Amino acid sequence: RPFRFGVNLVPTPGVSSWRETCRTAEQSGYDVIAVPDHLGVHSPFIAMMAAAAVTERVQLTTFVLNSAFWNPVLLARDLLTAHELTGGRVEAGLGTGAVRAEFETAGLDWGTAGTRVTRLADTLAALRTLAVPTPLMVGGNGDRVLGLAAEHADTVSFSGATLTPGTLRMITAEAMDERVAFFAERAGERDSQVERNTLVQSVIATDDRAATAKAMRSRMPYLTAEQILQLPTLLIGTPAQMAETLLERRERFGFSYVCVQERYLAAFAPVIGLLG
Ligand SMILES: C[C@H](OP(=O)(O)OC[C@@H](O)[C@@H](O)[C@@H](O)Cn1c2nc(=O)[nH]c(=O)c-2cc2ccc(O)cc21)C(=O)N[C@@H](CCC(=O)N[C@@H](CCC(=O)O)C(=O)O)C(=O)O
């Protein structure tokens, strides 16, 4: 599948730069602006509308909604509105919800891993029954979550890191091979209809990728330098090397929809120049 590139921006209360940041994202060649769903961050659909008003080409996506925060019927209303009032520029990523303290602040039951996945399941089923027109993305590496992506999603988002639900450990390329294979088995005949996404956490420009990886072992002692150079959540090297790495990872994992974090927007833009 042809590459699509996204940048995960954080619309921040009290910071007046949102419109400017969105314009920079488009001008730098990104295809998607992604926004998160967290307390203390601007509300995602409202921020996406503000982004749509200053950009003409990018898609806008949630990355990802906390399913506990949304009534499915009211979310379907929001998704139909965002679709119609942007001319079809909105996609919605959904997840189970990550931060317990946020559930508690909003007066919501954290429950169990099982109840949080069931909530996602119930929302996806409802959104499909209501025939929402926004493309749907499902993010997470859990068996049940990837099963839900295989059943319901237009895009599956694989996480390149694990964390205790309640900082982040990066997962090896070999564990990623297994997660993509798991997804593919669950998707069956629908596998080829689902776009595969991943979020790159760090984009490290360097003329010595090998020396960089060796130094980064201190942040990741459970891995060798060779493993670090294959981690899907890291891009290390020159832009040409990063482009070749992304080509190799599209072949290995199927990752064609690659997002980076806001802090790396300019660092990664040369790679868009080479790949497009
Ligand atoms: C928690 C996570 O599970 P997951 O299926 O990958 O993800 C579930 C949700 O977090 C996921 O659906 C999303 O809500 C998370 N999410 C966001 N969630 C949000 O709520 N808002 C966001 O803006 C958001 C952004 C986002 C972006 C990218 C991304 O990859 C995920 C994002 C995980 O790390 N699982 C690990 C660890 C599971 C584990 O072993 N847990 C232990 C350790 C915890 C303990 O000590 O008890 C246990 O439960 O006992 C694994 O599958 O191996």
Author numbering: 25 to 190, 195 to 304
According to the publication:
Central to this pathway is PepI, an F420H2-dependent oxidoreductase. PepI first catalyzes the formation of the central statine, then produces the C-terminal statine moiety. Among these, the homolog kvPepI from Kitasatospora viridis DSM44826, with 53.3% sequence identity to PepI, was more amenable to study.
The side chain of Tyr122 packs against the Leu side chain and the β-keto group of PreSta3 of 9 (2.7 Å). We thus wondered whether Tyr122 played a role in ketone reduction and produced kvPepIY122A and kvPepIY122F. When we tested the effect of kvPepIY122A on 9, we found ketone reduction to be significantly impaired, with only trace amounts of 13 observed. Moreover, we tested the activities of kvPepIY122A and kvPepIY122F in comparison to kvPepI using purified 13 and observed only a tiny amount of 17 with kvPepIY122F but no formation of 17 was observed with kvPepIY122A. A comparison of the structure of kvPepIY122A-F420 complex to the corresponding structure of the wild-type holoenzyme revealed no major structural perturbations caused by the mutation. Interestingly, mutating Tyr122 to Phe had a much greater effect on the second ketone reduction compared to the first step reduction, suggesting the vital role of the hydroxyl group of Tyr122 in positioning the substrate for the second reduction.
